[PDB]
Design a protein around this ligand. Structure first.
Ligand SMILES: [Zn+2]
Ligand SMILES: [Zn+2]
Ligand SMILES: [Zn+2]
Lengths: 52, 101
């Protein structure tokens, strides 16, 4: 017996390819960022990211 | 240090998706080195910051209570992306599709 409820940042990107998002990074400009903005519970339509 | 932005802006949600990508890449990008014992040169140097976060998240014992740089965000963000499923969620779903563009 070896139960488990949560691991460590499983995320749904373990199937994704680092090459795919790569092209998307250059397309948007994720590899040319000078100032990384802050990410804190801002909007109200995305409050689902609480996880509290 | 400076304070005055704990709730961030609404555009952050937009940056969340984009950031997730930097945190998404940085994720598999940070595990590709520790899982092989060695490290390799990365294309986009932006993943560096995340590498310091994902690594900090390991030293981050509060996670959702931490406020180190992006810690709470990297934890809060990856959190959504982790618990999020179905519904009108254009974050993990589309990023999981990758059908076109
Ligand atoms: Zn990288
Ligand atoms: Zn921390
Ligand atoms: Zn989601």
């Amino acid at each position: 017996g070896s139960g488990s409820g949560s691991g460590s940042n499983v995320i749904d990107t373990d199937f994704i390819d680092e090459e795919v998002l790569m092209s998307l990074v250059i397309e948007m400009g994720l590899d040319r960022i000078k100032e990384l903005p802050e990410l804190w519970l801002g909007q109200n339509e995305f409050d689902f990211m609480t996880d509290f | 240090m400076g304070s005055g932005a704990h709730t961030a802006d609404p555009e952050k949600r937009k940056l969340i998706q984009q950031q997730l990508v930097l945190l998404l890449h940085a994720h598999k990008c940070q595990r590709r080195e520790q899982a092989n014992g060695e490290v390799r040169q990365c294309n986009l140097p932006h993943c560096r910051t995340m590498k310091n976060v994902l690594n900090h998240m390991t030293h981050c014992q509060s996670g959702k209570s931490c406020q180190v740089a992006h810690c709470a965000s990297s934890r809060q963000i990856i959190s959504h992306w982790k618990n999020c499923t179905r519904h009108d969620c254009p974050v993990c779903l589309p990023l999981k599709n990758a059908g076109d563009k």
